[PDB]
Design a protein around this nucleic acid. Sequence first.
DNA 1: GGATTACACCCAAGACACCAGGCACGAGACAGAAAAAAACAACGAAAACGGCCACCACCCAAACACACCAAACACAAGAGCTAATTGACTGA
Length: 103
Amino acid sequence: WVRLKRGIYKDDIAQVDYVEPSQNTISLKMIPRIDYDRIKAPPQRLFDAEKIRSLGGDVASDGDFLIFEGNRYSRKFLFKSFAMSAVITEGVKPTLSELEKFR
DNA sequence: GGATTACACCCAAGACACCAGGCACGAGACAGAAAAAAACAACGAAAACGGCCACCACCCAAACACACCAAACACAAGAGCTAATTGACTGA
């Protein structure tokens, strides 16, 4: 488990899904901190594919896969690649709430 | 009553004379000065020994100046006017 440093996902929990051997970027699973392009022209909430398909805009659909604004990849839950220098790989220690979410 | 005038009188010059006190020599011996050996203070030579006393700091108790600091500066009342992040950094 890691936490991103920059962007709109500062100090947000990310589950390390796949470690790419290239030692450049690692695939991370995140909860979308987005408003589905409704007010902007945000808390952590479950990803609503139908909402972003109804609102339209920059969106590409592959059934359970999605590519939307910000070059953001989502599946079923964002699965996006970020550099290890942009995350912290030591000292996250998630709680039971994050286990349910992902002496 | 000092001195004079007059009237008895007893103490001693002088006499020889008795003779043992006194004086000119003589001897056993003795208190003492000449000489010598040994302690001794009078009086000046130092020294120690206090000894007040005038220093050299010594230490604390004001005396005085100065300067820095903080806190104060009458009540009420009405109205209007303006500001209350800010250029800009960095992913995207």
